[PDB]
Each structure stands twice: as C-alpha cells, then as structure tokens.
Design a protein around this ligand. Structure first.
Ligand SMILES: Nc1ncnc2c1ncn2[C@@H]1O[C@H](COP(=O)(O)OP(=O)(O)OP(=O)(O)O)[C@@H](O)[C@H]1O
Lengths: 394, 838
C-alpha cells in the first residue's frame, strides 16, 4: 500500500492528549519523545537461573557466579566495598552457550550500581572515582554492543531496520536507560572521557558487525588517532596548520564527506560513512567544519535531516516490538511474571494509531528535500509509512 | 674438486666485471652525439653481457646438481664474450681526416634574445637588485657574494643579465663570464681579463704565461676600484675556490654574483643563508600570459573551445620558462596548424614519447647536462625514478630501501651504516637541484619526493633505449621487440597485455593501484627476483615465496594480507620487511631463522615471537607492541647494539620490568630518535638515574593523556647535546625547566604540554627565563601548551630564527603590563594567533 503523508498538527492541548497515557503505560516510562519500578528488574533477579541448572554438565561456573550475583543483588553493602565485591566476577571471567550466559552475568551485575545510585546508596564522588578507570570503559563499551545484538538484532533485520542502527542512539532504548547517568555525570566533570568512551564504543561496534565493511577503519582501533583527536580538542588552531598524521586524517575524512555528498554510488557505504562521520562530529565538534563546502552544499542541515530518520525508525521499530508482543522484547528483558498477553487493549486504538500520525507529521515538517537525501530520507521514511499502515488492524 | 674449478673461475669473472664497468663508465661520460655507431653498439652488447655475468655470480653466491648448471652457464658466457671480442675487432677504421668541428653551446643564442620579449621577469629583478644594492648606499660595506640556485631552465642567466644591465654605470669594472662542465682555468681567467679592458688586454687569449702570473695580473688590476664580477654555470666547486683566491683583498663597495645548478656549492659561497637567492617557477597567470603571447595573435578568447586544453597542458610545464617557450614555438608552425587533435596527441605523447620530435632536441641537451655531470654510482639512482607513475608522491624511505636492495649502494670502509649512505645518495640527488623534496617525516627528515613531468619522460626515454625499465601504459601500449631481455617492469593503469611467457631473468616487478594483479599475472614463474613491490593491491595469496630465493625488498603496505607462510625462513638474504596496514595479527615462529635485516615496519597489533635478540644486524624497528611480555624477552632488546630509530606503544607491562627495559635501552649507542606511547598515566619507565645514549636527536612522545611528574634530571645540556626535537608532556611545569632547556645546543623543534592546566583546575602562570640572554640560538619551531609564553621573554636578540610560536593567554592579563608587545622581532614573527582564555 502506498500510504500518503499523515498530515496532522501537534499543538497546545494536544501533547498531553496522548503523552498522559504514555506517562503511565508500560512503554515510554524509560523513554521520551521528539515532540518535546525496581521490581521489574527484581523479578529477573529471581529468574536469573531459569535454565542454568538444566545443562550444568564446563557449565558449572555459570551457576557458581549466578548465586553469587543473586546474593550481591539483595544484600546491602557499603559503597567502599560493594565495588570490590562485584569486581571479583568482573575481573575473573575472560570470555557459544557459555557467552550467552556470561553476558547476562556481567550485564545484570552492573545494573545494580546504577540502581543503588538512584536510591542514593552510592556516593556520586565514589562513582566518579571508579568510572575514570580505564578497564571499565572497555567493559561497558563492549557489553552494551554485545547485549544489543543478543536480543534486538534478531528482530531488527527482519523489519529492515538493521541498516539504520546507530551507536550514539542506544541510551534512548527503555532497557538501556541507565546509561543516561553514566553519560551526563561523566561529561559534566570529565567531558573528554565521554568522547573517549564513545570513540572506543564505535570502534568495537564496527568490528562486531554493527557497521561492517570489507576495508579497514583508519579512524579507530589505534591509540595514536586519539593523540591528534585530543590535541585539536584543546588548541583551536592545530587544524588550520596541521602536522603529519593529520593531513592523512583530513584526506580520509573529506573523501568520505564527498562520498556522502555523492548520488549514484552504492548505499551501504553511505550508511557506513554516516555512522562514522556523525560519531566524529558529535564527539569531536568542529572536526569536519569545511566552512566553504558545507554552505554551498547544505551539508549542515543535510546531516541533521538524515539523522532524524534514524530516531524516527527506532521509534517505529519500538512500536512494532510493542504490537506483536501484545520474544521481540528481547531475552532476559521482560520477566514472565510481568509478561504481556495477546489480548488487544482498548487504550491502543486511541494512543497508538493516532500517535503514528503525529510521529509521521513530526517527521514530515522540517526535513529538507534533495534527490540524494530522498534516497536517504524520503525512500526509507515512505517505506516505513507503507509498512506501518499494513499491520495496525491485525 | 668440481666446485674448485667453478670457484676459481668466479674471481676471473668478477675481474671481467670490474673491467666492464670501467669501460662502460668511460664511454657513458661523452654525450651520445660524438660517439660513433660501432662504439654505441659494442657498449650496448657489453652491457647485456654484464647483466648475464652478474646473474651468474649472484646465483653462485646464493647457492653455495647446481654445479654443472653453473659450469655450463659460465662456459657459454665466456664463449659469447670471446666471440664479441673479434666481432668488434673485425671492423675498425681510423679516418685521420675525420676532424669534425666541436658542437657549439646549445644555450648561447638563447642569451641573444630580445629584451622586449620576456614577461614577468619584473618584481624579481628588482628584488634581487635591492637585496644587494641596499648596501650599495654607503658604498663601503665589505664585499659579498649572492649565488643563484635553480634547476632545468627556469631562467638564471636571464635574470643575472637583467641585473647586470641596470645598475652598472655606478661601477668601475665588471665581467660576465661563463664556465662549462670541464673548464680550462687559464681560459676562464683570460675571459675575465678580456671583459675588464679590451685595449690593454686585446689579444690576451694568445699569451700563455701560467695559471699564476695572470692571477697576479688580475689581482693587481683590481686595486682601489669596485668590480662587480659575475660568474655563472660553475660546477664542482673545486673550480670556484681557485677563482676565489683571485678575490682575496679588502675592497669596500664591491660584490659579485654567481649562478649554479647545485646548492651544494653555493653554500660554499657568501658564508650566510641570507645571501642565497632561491629562484622559483613563475605563477599560473604569468605563465598563461607568456603562453598566449607566442601562439596567439593578441588575444586568447578567440578559441573559447580549446581553453581547457590550454590550462591542462600549461600545468605540465609548471612554471619553467623553457617548456612554455618550446611548446609554444613547436605547436604553432604558422597560426594553429590544426585544432584540438594534435594537442591531444601531444598531451598523450608526453610521458612516453614526446621527446622524439623536431626542433626539440636543442632543448633536451640543456636538461641532460645535469644527468651527464653526475658521477657514477648515481646514474642508476636517477634512472630508477622512471618506475613510479607520472604524478604520485614517492617516500624517500622507499627509494633508499629499493636502492639498497637492488645493489646500487656499497663501499669498503666499514665505517658506514650502509643506510645513511643511501641517505647521502638521496641528499646528493636533492642538492643537485634535480628532485623536489616535501614534508618532514617522523624520522626527522624529508617525507617524500616528486619528479618534474618532462624530466620524467626524458629519463624514461634514456632508460628506454636500454632495458633498464619497462612501462606498460595505454597511451604508449608498446612492448620492446624482445620479450627475453626484460629486467625491470613498472606496470601501470594498463590491464590488457599482461603476458608473462618469456621473462626468465626478471630482476624486479611492481604494480601500481591495479586489480589486474594475480588474476592475470603470475610471479612464481620468475625463477629469480631481486625486489618485489605490491603495495596498494587487494590480494592475500603471498605464499609462493618459498619457491623464490633472491628477494631483498618485500613491500606489502595496504594489501589485505590475512596470513603469510611458515616457509619464509628460506629467505636468508633479505633487507626490508614492511607489513603495515595488513590483516595478519601474529607473525610465524620462522623469523628466528632469519639472519640479515635492517628495517621491520611492523604494527603493534601483531605478536613478536620470543628470541628477538638474535637479529643483531637489525637497524630500525617501528611500532612494537609491548603487552603481556616476559622479562627475558624484554631484556633481549638490549642485545642488539645497532638500532637507530625505535617506536614503542604499549598498554600492559607498567611494572619494574619497565625499568628493566629502561636501562636496557642504554646498552645501545647508535640511537638518533625515539618515542614512547602510553595512555593517561604517570610514566613508570624512566628513572632519574639512567645514562642516555650519547647520540639523540628527536625523542618524541606521541601520547598527551599520560604525563611525567616533573622534568627528568637526565635531560641536560651535558648528555645528548644533539637534540633537534623535544615533544614532551608532563603533569606539572616549572619556570626553571625552561631555563634548563634553553642551554641545549640545537633544539630545532619544541613542543611542551602542561597536563594540569588542561585537565585540572589550574591557572596558566608566567614562567620566567631568568639566567642567560638568548638560550635559543636556533629554534624555528616552538610550541607551548597550557603554558604562558609572552613575547617579552627577552629582546629580539634571543631567538634569531623562530617562525612559529604557540602559547595560552588569560583574558585577565589584558589589562596588565606583562604582554607588552608591539615591536617586530628578528625572525618572521608576525603571523600568530593566541589561544585566549577568559
Ligand atoms: N621570463 C622569461 N620569458 C621568456 N623566456 C624566459 C624567461 N625566463 C627565462 N626564459 C628562458 O629560459 C632560458 C634561460 O635559461 P637560464 O637562465 O636558466 O640558463 P643558465 O643559467 O645558463 O642555465 P640553465 O638553463 O641550465 O639553468 C632561456 O631559454 C630564456 O629565453
């Protein structure tokens, strides 16, 4: 079906029409909108060993650390020692089914610290003194991308949203909501370390197949890159008169910028170039600031126009992950006690199909139009609009 | 027994070689016009024989079944040498009355050209006038020289004559005198004498006194006068010093001008870099005006359809006011012979076949002058430049390693690294004004080199008449009429004729940015191969090398190589091994078996097997990965006391074993540069009690998140006085650290990072240069990060040469009086922007 643009209007006395339902419903509690509780994880803290005991026969350390994490979950320990207790498993395990449960060991253990911080059980300065640690940055930047591909990548590919997975929009997920503190509290004090951890995170993301390619990545997986990256982050005049190993970086970034500005070429490498250049721009502002080329190519607004579609498609995929569940929510994400049955809900007819029209109207309101952009913005958005209007009744 | 006869023939063979390079060196000196055809053909054949016996001796050397093959080969080669002897001897004649007159100078009538013809010569003639006549006022300043260095025919005698014509009536004497490649000193001095007075010294060319009495005469004639002599085209400065003594008396108000094609002889004059006058190619607009002056009538917009051809061709000349004259005169026989077709034919022809034309060879002699003036052991170095494509930068390190691997560098003094010898060859090529250098790499020296376009095709032709190289280009699409005798092949964009049937003796082969490799070409069929170059390819199949024995150079930069075979130990002879940009992440154990090597451009991602100290001959190592390593292997690094340049990054051994390696470093004394990379930590490697190697120049530090506590004590003007590069970062800062650093002799490059300012709540203080006056005799590049360097460290007489400066400036000091600038310092200290902090 070739559904046209759902022309609507989100004005005063209409934002609270639906967000009020979103202010209390099961989804959107850990999310937000672009128009602008501990028992849930505790039940998984009980379900932590649903199947570990089934195949203990090698497979004993999984249950050995399982009950240890269960003990550490509910027991109250001073912050000066809780980190030492929890790091015993973190610094011990090195690395198919094994890792399928090893990640759940690491992922659930780290969620405790943020939960205690939300309850003011852990001092903020104590958290600061441990987040600056080098190894834990590598632990988190690895476990996030591993956990996402554990559950959401299986269903993302089928919908066709796999090609539009962006690393910098991962905190917006309801499950990965605790990262907001790890981001803002870290950037407020040590802002450089935020770009540092993002630079690492995209680096592991590239080589795990999130943004795969047959050619090497000349921007990541090398400490010497960050040397110049941080050198220009302080002196605002080291790029106008650059040293060597920096003309090379400019030559590899402007080439990708021209690739992005190109029209006919294959699209997957535009996707790869986008997921690189947006990361470098958001973490290292003023690194592709070609003051002459961008103005006569409308690059500054083109990047934002092609960026907004990613969040739009993420929200559409979230709605799809909600409709059929009423497991696409992901393994170890929703406990069976709080599971969602199959029955249709009356509140969906007033807050879901209407909200889709609001979302598409908000998508079709300030995005510029260009034939190159249309292949990047108009075509995928129209495909999503066609797909979203063929499944709501069923 | 049997081997004894072969080995006793080998020395006879090598003597035969030495004789043949003797005679070939003798013949190649003369230009290829005075040579008769018999001698040319004989030389052509003896060169091929030279290749054959070099092949035989190399094969015998690498091997020791084979004895009988070597025997047959040497016997037959002796047979062709013996035959060719009387083939030459059969046809000789004397012809006593063959005295053809010597050729005139090709660039003489060029001196006789119209004054109202040259364009753009202005605003350079005036500048060269007032860079020396500014002292003509108060005409009592001591005499000085101003040399002019250039290349090709960019125009040096022209401007010398121009300055030699305007400011003359204010002088008593003067002489414009030329010098050839092999001058006669008495001839030159007679030339000077006749140029001073033609009356008393009318028939001065007749008398033959001696080299000395006429020198006394010219010295006597130069009393109480200002001469202003100019001498041009002087080569091999040993000539210059003889004339120099003729100017040895005090003479206020005089001076002289010199031109030459070698900068390595101009610095022998004028005792200062301020008096050297570099000359540069003309600008695009002036070149366009000159180009349209000749061909077109008075205006250039008439075609409006070959314009793009015009600027496309004109950039090939670059700025040389010789090519833009030659092509302008060639292309218009009488008013645009035809349109856009011969222009395309000409554009295609350049690079491979443009030189062979009419009224053009009168210009190529002026360029082959430089090639002929080269000594031996340097002609192959220049002719090696034809391999690489037309417009591509060439890293000097690649050239040096290729030369050494080929075998063009050797000596018998045992005091030479055999690598700085290659650097010497490269610098000799550069100072002859015949290669353009660019950049300054991590070695502290030039990054890469570029070759002029028409010079490139000219040397291509010179290498083409023999079989020095072979090029496969689609505008050329030519193959020599003998597939057998091909040694060097430089494959390029052409991907059609990749036939490999008949090159058994294949010296070297290279591919440039082509996907045709592998799917069409086979390398394993080359029984012998000196160097292999495959950088930029997209093939990972290099596992047939075990079938090959004679490789020296092995370049695999950016090749998508996943793995390399375990059978690489068979390559006992090898000099270089570059693996940067490859997918392989662990080297095979069969590198202990290797014996000879000097450079290993490896990436820290890969794993180095234990037993590295065996490679005693190793001379430079790059980007070594030091993580999870046992202490014995760490100490193995101090075993090899020959390494010069080492690059280290690491994440996983910050223990006392760091100090174990720290003193292990001092076991070596051949160092010249070093650098250490580590992430956001205090430097737990270097102690304050550790003697450094005596020779150190660079000592960089790429990391900026890590820091030292303070300035190390072992840095002192006492030890390591050879530094020309600093690159330090540390936590704190002291106003005495700068004072200490100001005592070191050179310190050309300075870059200091203050960690606490850009990472902790600290205010940029103002360090004070307390002791001394200058502390910086020569510091062109100085960088201060997070440290306040006001312009008033000292009056202008502190840093004579300083082009660049960087420091941080608080906004609170705006109302202060410690920023008291406004004067112009001695160096070009007028281009600066300061990072200001609120
Ligand atoms: N502005 C100009 N306009 C026209 N022709 C020029 C101009 N400048 C130089 N030329 C030409 O360039 C040549 C000058 O050569 P140049 O002065 O370099 O000679 P040189 O010093 O004897 O040695 P070499 O040519 O080897 O450097 C002449 O052909 C001259 O006509």
């Amino acid at each position: 079906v070739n559904f046209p643009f759902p022309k609507k209007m989100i004005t005063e006395s209409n934002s609270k029409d639906i967000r009020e339902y979103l202010a209390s419903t099961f989804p959107f509690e850990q999310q937000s909108t672009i128009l602008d509780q501990l028992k849930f994880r505790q039940e998984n803290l009980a379900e932590l060993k649903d199947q570990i005991i089934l195949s203990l026969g090698n497979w004993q350390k999984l249950l050995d650390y399982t009950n240890k994490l269960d003990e550490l979950s509910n027991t109250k320990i001073s912050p000066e020692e809780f980190i030492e207790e929890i790091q015993k498993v973190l610094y011990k395990v090195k690395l198919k089914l094994y890792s399928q449960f090893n990640l759940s060991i690491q992922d659930f253990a780290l969620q405790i610290i943020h939960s205690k911080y939300k309850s003011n059980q852990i001092s903020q300065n104590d958290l600061l003194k441990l987040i600056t640690e080098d190894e834990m940055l590598k632990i988190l930047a690895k476990t996030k991308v591993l956990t996402y591909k554990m559950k959401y990548f299986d269903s993302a590919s089928k919908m066709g949203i796999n090609k539009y997975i962006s690393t910098e929009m991962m905190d917006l997920d309801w499950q990965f909501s605790h990262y907001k503190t790890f981001n803002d509290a870290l950037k407020k004090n040590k802002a450089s370390d935020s770009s540092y951890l993002g630079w690492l995170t995209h680096g592991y993301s590239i080589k795990y197949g999130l943004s795969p390619n047959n050619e090497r990545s000349m921007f990541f997986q090398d400490g010497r890159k960050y040397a110049e990256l941080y050198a220009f982050s302080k002196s605002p005049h080291r790029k106008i008169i650059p040293g060597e190993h920096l003309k090379d970086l400019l030559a590899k970034i402007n080439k990708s910028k021209g690739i992005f500005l190109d029209q006919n070429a294959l699209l997957d490498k535009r996707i790869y170039a986008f997921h690189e250049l947006n990361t470098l721009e958001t973490h290292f502002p003023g690194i592709t600031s070609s003051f002459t080329d961008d103005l006569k190519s409308n690059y500054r607004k083109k990047m934002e126009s092609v960026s907004l579609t990613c969040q739009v498609l993420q929200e559409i995929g979230n709605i799809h992950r909600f409709i059929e569940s009423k497991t696409e929510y992901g393994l170890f994400s929703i406990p069976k006690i709080f599971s969602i049955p199959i029955d249709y809900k009356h509140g969906e007819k007033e807050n879901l199909v209407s909200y889709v029209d609001f979302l598409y109207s908000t998508a079709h309101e300030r995005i510029l139009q260009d034939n190159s952009i249309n292949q990047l913005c108009l075509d995928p958005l129209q495909e999503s609009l066609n797909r979203i209007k063929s499944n709501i009744p069923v | 027994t049997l081997e004894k006869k072969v080995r006793k023939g080998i020395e006879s063979l090598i003597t035969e070689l030495k004789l043949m390079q003797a005679v070939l060196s003798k013949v190649s000196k003369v230009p290829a016009d005075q040579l008769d055809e018999g001698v040319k053909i004989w030389a052509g054949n003896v060169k091929e024989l030279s290749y054959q016996m070099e092949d035989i001796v190399d094969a015998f050397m690498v091997r020791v079944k084979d004895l009988h093959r070597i025997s047959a080969a040497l016997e037959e080669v002796v047979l062709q040498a013996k035959q060719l002897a009387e083939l030459r001897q059969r046809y000789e004649q004397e012809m006593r009355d063959t005295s053809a007159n010597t050729s005139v100078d090709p660039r003489m009538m060029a001196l006789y050209t119209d004054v109202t013809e040259l364009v753009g010569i202005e605003e350079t003639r005036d500048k060269l006038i007032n860079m020396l006549t500014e002292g003509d006022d108060w005409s009592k300043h001591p005499l000085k020289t101003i040399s002019i260095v250039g290349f090709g025919g960019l125009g040096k005698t022209t401007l010398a004559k121009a300055a030699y014509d305007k400011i003359k009536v204010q002088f008593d004497c003067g002489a414009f005198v030329s010098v050839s490649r092999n001058p006669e000193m008495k001839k030159v001095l007679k030339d000077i004498l006749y140029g001073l007075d033609k009356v008393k010294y009318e028939n001065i060319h007749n008398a033959a006194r001696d080299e000395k009495y006429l020198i006394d005469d010219i010295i006597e004639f130069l009393n109480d006068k200002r001469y202003l002599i100019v001498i041009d085209d002087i080569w091999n400065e040993k000539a210059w010093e003889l004339i120099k003594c003729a100017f040895s008396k005090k003479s206020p108000g005089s001076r002289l001008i010199t031109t030459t094609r070698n900068v390595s002889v101009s610095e022998a004059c004028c005792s200062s870099e301020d008096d050297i006058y570099r000359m540069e190619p003309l600008s695009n607009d002036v070149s366009r005006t000159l180009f349209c002056k000749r061909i077109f009538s008075q205006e250039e917009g008439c075609p409006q359809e070959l314009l793009k051809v015009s600027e496309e061709i004109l950039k090939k000349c670059g700025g040389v006011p010789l090519a833009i004259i030659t092509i302008a005169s060639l292309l218009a026989n009488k008013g645009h012979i035809k349109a856009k077709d011969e222009w395309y034919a000409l554009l295609s022809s350049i690079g491979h076949g443009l030189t062979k034309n009419r009224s053009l060879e009168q210009m190529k002699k002026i360029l082959l002058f430089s090639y002929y003036d080269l000594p031996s052991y340097l002609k192959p170095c220049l002719l090696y430049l034809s391999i690489f494509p037309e417009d591509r930068e060439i890293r000097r390190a690649r050239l040096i390693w290729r030369w050494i691997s080929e075998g063009f560098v050797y000596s018998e003094k045992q005091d030479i690294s055999l690598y700085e010898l290659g650097d010497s060859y490269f610098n000799e090529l550069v100072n002859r004004s015949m290669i353009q250098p660019i950049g300054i790499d991590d070695e502290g020296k030039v990054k890469a080199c570029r070759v002029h376009d028409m010079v490139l095709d000219l040397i291509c032709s010179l290498s083409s008449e023999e079989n020095f190289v072979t090029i496969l280009d689609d505008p050329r699409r030519k193959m020599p009429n003998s597939e057998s005798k091909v040694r060097r092949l430089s494959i390029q964009n052409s991907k059609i004729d990749v036939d490999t049937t008949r090159m058994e003796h294949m010296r070297s082969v290279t591919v440039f940015s082509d996907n045709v490799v592998g799917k069409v070409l086979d390398i394993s069929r080359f029984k012998v191969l000196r160097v292999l170059d495959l950088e930029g390819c997209h093939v990972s199949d290099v596992g047939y090398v075990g079938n090959l024995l004679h490789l020296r150079y092995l370049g695999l930069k950016g090749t998508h190589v996943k793995d390399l075979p375990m059978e690489i130990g068979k390559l006992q002879f090898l000099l270089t091994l570059d693996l940067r940009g490859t997918k392989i992440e662990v080297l095979p154990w069969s590198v202990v078996q290797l014996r000879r090597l000097m450079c290993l451009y490896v990436d820290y991602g890969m794993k180095l097997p234990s037993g590295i100290g065996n490679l005693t001959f190793l001379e430079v190592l790059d980007d070594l990965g030091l993580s999870d390593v046992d202490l014995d292997f760490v100490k193995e690094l101090g075993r090899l006391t020959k390494l010069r340049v080492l690059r280290l990054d690491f994440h996983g051994f910050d223990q006392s074993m760091g100090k174990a390696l720290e003193e292990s470093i001092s076991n070596m004394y051949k160092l010249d540069s070093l650098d250490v990379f580590v992430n956001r930590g205090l430097i737990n490697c270097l102690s304050e009690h550790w003697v450094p190697p005596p020779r150190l120049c660079r000592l960089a530090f790429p990391s900026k998140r890590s820091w030292f506590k303070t300035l190390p004590s072992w840095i002192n003007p006492s030890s390591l006085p050879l530094l020309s590069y600093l690159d330090i970062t540390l936590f704190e800062v002291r106003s005495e650290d700068i004072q200490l650093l100001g005592t070191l002799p050179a310190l050309v490059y300075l870059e200091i990072w203050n960690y606490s300012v850009f990472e902790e709540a600290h205010e940029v203080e103002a360090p004070v240069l307390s002791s001394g006056a200058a502390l910086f005799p020569c510091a062109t590049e100085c960088r201060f990060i997070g440290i306040g360097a006001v312009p008033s460290m000292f009056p202008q007489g502190a840093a004579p040469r300083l082009k660049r400066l960087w420091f941080t400036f608080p906004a609170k000091w705006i109302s202060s009086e410690n920023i008291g600038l406004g004067m112009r310092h001695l160096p070009s200290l007028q281009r600066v922007v300061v990072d200001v902090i609120s």
